[PDB]
């Protein structure tokens, strides 16, 4: 059934599973027209499909041409997400196909179930976790590839860089969610924390800086401070 705090360790067991987040598939800017009406302009988006055990990210870039001449785009976006996730599953060798797909938004359940009817043994599940995957576009290298795309494109990444050489999947996922929650809550301050030391760089083959174990402890504490600081600012606490 639904994935929550009780069954959290399940995310890191040996059954292949993927999170699917559709929050960045259909992205628009809203603006006034010459006549003083309001219009939207779409920008490139992406499907965020992540294996929480291994860190493998299947970033399907959704180019604005896929919306051309289409109506009810917010509805279409859910079905396009499901079509693309289904296509990804079919493209994977049998032994790499997931046994479960966990959608971050319950409105994805029916579109994905319908697209996956040929895979009756792949469980489609919602989650009660509030995951910050909408902030994936705050990771500079992910935003850049999405914005530069001139056509539909599938880009593969490891969202954990090389962290699994030193930490478990459980800890890597916790670090990722802390970083993304901080970037979602105060992007400017979070990016300042991550780059406030010029001597620590992001490898050409990495998304995040090359912090030592001790530096990651400091960074994680600074991210928690940022989140708590923003909570106090928001609620006047």
């Amino acid at each position: 059934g639904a994935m929550n705090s009780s069954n959290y360790a399940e995310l890191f067991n040996n059954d292949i599973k993927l999170f699917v987040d559709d929050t960045n598939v259909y992205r628009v800017t809203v603006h006034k027209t010459f006549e003083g009406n309001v219009a939207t302009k779409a920008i490139n988006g992406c499907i965020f499909t992540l294996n929480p055990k291994t860190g493998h990210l299947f970033l399907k870039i959704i180019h604005t041409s896929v919306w051309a001449g289409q109506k009810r785009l917010s509805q279409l976006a859910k079905w396009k997400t499901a079509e693309e996730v289904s296509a990804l599953v079919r493209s994977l060798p049998k032994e790499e196909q997931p046994k479960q797909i966990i959608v971050t938004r319950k409105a994805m359940l029916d579109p994905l179930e319908v697209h996956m009817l040929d895979f009756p043994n792949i469980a489609i599940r919602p989650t009660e976790l509030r995951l910050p995957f909408s902030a994936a576009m705050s990771i500079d290298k992910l935003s850049d590839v999405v914005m530069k795309a001139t056509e539909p494109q599938m880009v593969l990444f490891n969202i954990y860089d090389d962290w699994l050489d030193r930490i478990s999947s459980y800890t890597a996922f916790s670090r990722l969610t802390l970083l993304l929650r901080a970037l979602k809550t105060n992007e400017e301050s979070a990016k300042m924390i991550l780059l406030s030391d010029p001597t620590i760089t992001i490898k050409s083959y990495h998304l995040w800086p090359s912090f030592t174990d001790e530096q990651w402890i400091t960074i994680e504490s600074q991210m928690r401070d940022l989140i708590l600081t923003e909570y106090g600012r928001k609620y006047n606490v």
Binding site: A82, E83, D110, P111, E113, V114, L117, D118
Partner: protein, 300 residues
């Protein structure tokens, strides 16, 4: 007019015949029902006074044979049987009529209710939903499950309604996932009407039979089927006009006939609100919408 005699009434029982009902006392000199209108299917049904568990009954058509009811004290129920000896049957009925031991089917001349509820219901189709080929009549009860319920456990005692499942490969063409899920017209017109039912009359006949089994027996799986067959039409953008207008008539008489106090158990809020107010056909069921709003405004 035809007659279903009863050998006797050894246990106290509420007897239904179509939409009518009457009470019979233990060992009362009751010997059947006469003046049954020829031309329609009928249902004779039972609920025991000492055990309201198991409503049960029999669908039959007096044009197909001579039927009577006799209580079986071993199996503990009123059973329908066929009498193959015509002269014997006529002699039995005539004596019971002469002694006035029979109730008369109480049809008012102005009253088309039973026709309206059974317009498309045929005995031959009933006998394919309820499979017991050695009898010309069909037993249904409150507890019988449907083929679809069983899939989700005695197959010989199932209700073989046509399986409708909106999230199934049968309902969704590969490559038309969004289209077919949001507009069920393919599934209704190509799969169901052209493919399985062959025509709208057979579809409506099953829909009507499901409703009647839900109402007369409280058969839950039948209620599920009735609602599924309504929702399939209402969720289709492209439905022949004659079907929409006939559906409105069908549903109007079903809602009219439903006991006011059984609405909480026989009507699905989601389906009715979707069909009447959100669906493609929300403006195509004027008579049903008006009776539903005036009779069951709480459900909505």
């Amino acid at each position: 007019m035809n007659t279903v005699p009863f050998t006797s009434a050894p246990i106290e029982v509420t007897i239904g015949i179509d939409q009518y009902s009457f009470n019979v006392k233990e060992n009362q000199p009751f010997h059947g029902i006469k003046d049954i209108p020829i031309g329609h299917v009928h249902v004779i049904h039972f609920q025991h006074a000492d055990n309201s568990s198991m409503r049960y009954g029999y669908w039959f058509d007096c044009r197909m044979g001579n039927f009577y009811i006799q209580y079986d004290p071993k199996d503990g129920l009123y059973k329908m049987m066929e009498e193959r000896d015509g002269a014997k049957f006529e002699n039995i009925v005539h004596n019971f009529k002469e002694r006035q031991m029979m109730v008369s089917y109480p049809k008012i001349d102005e009253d088309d209710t039973w026709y309206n509820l059974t317009e498309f219901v045929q005995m031959d189709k009933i006998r394919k939903i309820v499979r017991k080929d050695e009898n010309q009549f069909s037993y249904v009860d409150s507890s019988m499950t449907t083929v679809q319920e069983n899939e989700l456990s005695d197959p010989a005692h199932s209700l073989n309604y046509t399986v409708i499942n909106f999230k199934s490969r049968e309902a969704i063409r590969p490559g038309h996932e969004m289209e077919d899920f949001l507009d069920k017209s393919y599934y209704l017109n190509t799969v169901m009407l052209q493919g399985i039912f062959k025509n709208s009359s057979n579809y409506f006949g099953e829909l009507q039979f499901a409703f009647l089994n839900a109402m007369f027996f409280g058969n839950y799986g039948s209620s599920l089927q009735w609602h599924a067959m309504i929702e399939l039409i209402c969720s289709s953008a492209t439905v022949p006009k004659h079907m929409l207008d006939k559906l409105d008539e069908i549903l109007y008489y079903q809602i009219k006939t439903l006991p006011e106090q059984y609405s909480d158990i026989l009507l699905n809020e989601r389906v009715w609100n979707i069909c009447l107010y959100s669906s493609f056909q929300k403006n195509s069921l004027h008579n049903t919408e008006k009776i539903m709003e005036n009779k069951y405004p709480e459900l909505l």
